[PDB]
Subunit: 376 residues, 3 copies
């Protein structure tokens, strides 16, 4: 049999479908990561974080030497998935395998195209299969593997011994997003350009020593003009049940609400203390631009690296750039531009279109040495 | 053949026998490590260091959802092995393979149960086989492997391609204790609750530039009321032979004396300098409790992390615990409790039973800012 | 088939040919690395950096217990290869495989002999095959692999599933020098004791924002009494072509000049700015000694760790050595010895032969606290 000595014939066709994704051995990085071709039309799947800090996305296909510009079809930050599009025909495509028919001990190979100058393949097994308790993806097998997963092959393919895609490599002993979930996500992203999720409007924490005397999710904040606000949910409410089913923690509440649609009607059990109250309400419901300055929104993750700051965070400033001698550094926060108060990346971009090339005043905060004005 | 594509059918039965061991995806750690079921009676083998800092040992079996309390059958700190017991019948058991019939290049898989929510399996080969020169375990193959060995699977199983146990994973490219040694050790531990070893009573160092003009073990300390003390062995004695066989270094002396029984008669050749002298003598011969404060004895390893300190070392103090606001920190040393002078963990425990719940005065040393009194 | 359960029979003969290389489990390091026996005459191949800081090279063969002194047949620092010789017959030799007939996904095993007390083998696949654009080794496949490559097995063997050498392990997910290149290099090193390469005499940098308005290599320095100096090449010359073929960068210029012989005639296109000029010229054209003090030449790599320093760098000084109490430290620079001005290791050695054992004055610089005189 071929596999006594090599797996090359089993994986060679899959290798053809794993592309590199870049911006702007050796110098060619500037490399963002890998992607996988899924349709002959030119659709490619990758991680969200691979293309997160990049406009002008460039794709390198095995045996091409030519970079193709890609446009962002859609993103899903919760699943860390994204679909981009290039204009070309008769492309090699990956063949999907059923990710619920894989077992611990199956041979798998992780394929990446780290720099657009060839593939890199690592060999291992399915080490563990992890099903979350809850949500629309309750029974999806998230894949651990001892095939090396790394930023080189993040966004690339994780294939079985017959060359079928069982997952999308995700780097941040190795994790892969299962291929059934990937198929469904890319189908929703080619349509609709997004994943529509319900939104309640509450910040959440778990119970430690409160006797509330139950389990559930403690409401620590109620966003203004939200369904939770308009329904009458207050801070310190313990959300215990959704539609008559208990939520043990904020994880289950998050995934059950997120598995629901916008404008969908939902009912919640809450403990003020300790009188059960019932609420019935309608559910409601952030990529940034690059340049040489980049910015990003202050997500709860971002302000961790700080509440109540408003505006964008200048994530990185490359050296000797036309925006570094202006005065921009890393970790600053753009709070005002001329007459537009910057509270998010959208405000940033709207301010940028108005009066571009014209003189422009930024009020930008530094955590140390602070508020300074930059005339760009 | 099955192994062209997967090893699952070959390892699935072995996976059933690898349990998780815990105390007190996600929160469930509090995880100590893995263990292996070896008898249908309910005996489980693991590393000593997995259960070292834990009373109230809890065991999670694959496909159970129910934690079973385990009692400590026995420990062996030199071999880093331990046997615990749970009350259950018709358990799945591991099948042992002969660890002296394995070869470099054999396929092996390391199985752990890191958090009690499923197995984790890594694949590799036997990378190296290491036999020590000396002792009762002279010809046991200690196993290196490029199957990943880590705290997740430490104490778990290392199996061959047919699912037979070839070793017990040990984390501290991967090391495993051979299965023949494990079988013998667990057999001695189910009986006797311990591994009986002879004790001489000397601290030892090797030769560097002494011309003693030989090889052997330099005696740097003679413990009081020990066979070496009562036989007339002095500091700076060079122990060169045991029962007419040369010892090259303190390693060989350690393993030859430790391979002997308590109350066993032994003869030693020594060089005062350089007149050979002969001694004939009878050989002679430490787990701690937890709580939220833990303590441990000051082993020669422990005071390295300091001679001549006496008493326990408070290894860790968890945050916001009822014993942290008392004043206990990490790295302190409890030297006195009321009228009991604490010289070991046994003194600590004996002091604790007397007057528990009653007011209690600790004299505890800090390496900086030092002696302080805590009224618990 | 054998490979469903083990690869031992396929690799056992290759393991016999992988030796350990040392100087001067446990104490036996003092270990430099691994090597591979390639001829029954006693020729062994290894990395240059394994034997770089060592005279008195000792070789341990599997199943020997006897160390054999080795003499340095030849070195090639650019390819990080070296050939040494021991006196013994009927040795086990490695069998070469064609390194241009390997594929990504082929099974490979990395064999080392890290401490001379047995082999260590790691398993993986060919992860990537990397061909440089240019030079005599344009089409040699440099091998990446997820078989672990590490200082233990650096200089050892990388073999296919049939036991044939496909590369020499190189540590500094794992890199191996292809076996065809290794065969050619060792053949040139057994003859000639070296790899003869052409030399131009220019320091080089790439283009960033110069509009030169081309691609090529910028000359930043012209060594005195060199072919470039005598031909009339000046600083800031842009070397664009060699023998009518364009060089994109200093990498291509380096490899095309280095692929040429000493005394070979070559023509170059240069841009002063922007008038093309043509030059035609003849091409022209460093291991150190150890002791307890070591020294090395100030290569451009070495002064990075500083231009224009002249003399040797004392790389390391072992503790309590007869040369440490003299005053030698790490990072100092020996600039003068008695009447010999030390500008390289050759000057160092020539100074050492004159008046050895006689009183001897070193003028040695320290980057801090600086010039001090040592009377050895």
């Amino acid at each position: 049999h071929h596999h006594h000595h090599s797996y090359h014939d089993s994986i060679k066709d899959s290798i053809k479908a794993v592309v590199n994704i870049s911006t702007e051995k050796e110098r060619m990085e500037r490399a963002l990561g890998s992607g996988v071709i899924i349709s002959k039309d030119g659709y490619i799947v990758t991680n969200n974080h691979v293309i997160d800090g990049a406009d002008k996305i460039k794709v390198t296909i095995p045996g091409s030497n030519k970079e193709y510009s890609a446009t962002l079809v859609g993103t899903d930050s919760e699943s860390d998935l994204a679909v981009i599009r290039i204009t070309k025909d008769n492309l090699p495509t990956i063949k999907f395998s059923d990710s619920n028919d894989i077992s611990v001990g199956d041979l798998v190979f992780a394929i990446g195209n780290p720099f657009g100058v060839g593939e890199s393949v690592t060999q291992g097994i399915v080490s563990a299969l992890n099903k979350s308790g809850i949500g629309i993806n309750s029974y999806e097998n998230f894949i651990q593997t001892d095939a090396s997963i790394n930023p080189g092959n993040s966004g690339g393919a994780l294939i079985d011994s017959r060359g079928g895609l069982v997952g999308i490599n995700t780097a941040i002993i190795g994790f892969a997003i299962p291929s059934n979930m990937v198929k469904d996500t890319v189908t929703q992203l080619i349509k609709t350009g997004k994943i529509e999720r319900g939104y309640l409007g509450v910040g959440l924490q778990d119970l430690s020593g409160d006797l509330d005397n139950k389990e559930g999710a403690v409401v620590i904040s109620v966003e203004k003009d939200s369904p939770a606000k308009k329904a009458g949910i207050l801070v310190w409410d313990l959300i215990t049940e959704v539609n008559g089913k208990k939520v043990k923690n904020t994880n289950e509440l998050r995934n059950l609400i997120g598995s629901m649609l916008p404008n969908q009607r939902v009912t919640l059990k809450v403990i003020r203390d300790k009188k059960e109250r019932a609420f019935t309400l309608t559910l409601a419901e952030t990529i940034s631009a690059q340049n040489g300055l980049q910015v990003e929104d202050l997500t709860q993750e971002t302000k961790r690296s700080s509440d109540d700051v408003q505006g964008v965070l200048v994530s990185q400033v490359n050296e000797n750039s036309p925006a570094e001698q202006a005065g921009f550094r890393q970790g600053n926060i753009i709070t005002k531009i001329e007459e537009v108060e910057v509270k998010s990346v959208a405000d940033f971009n709207h301010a940028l279109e108005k009066y571009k090339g014209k003189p422009k005043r930024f009020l930008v905060l530094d955590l140390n040495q602070g508020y300074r004005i930059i005339l760009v």
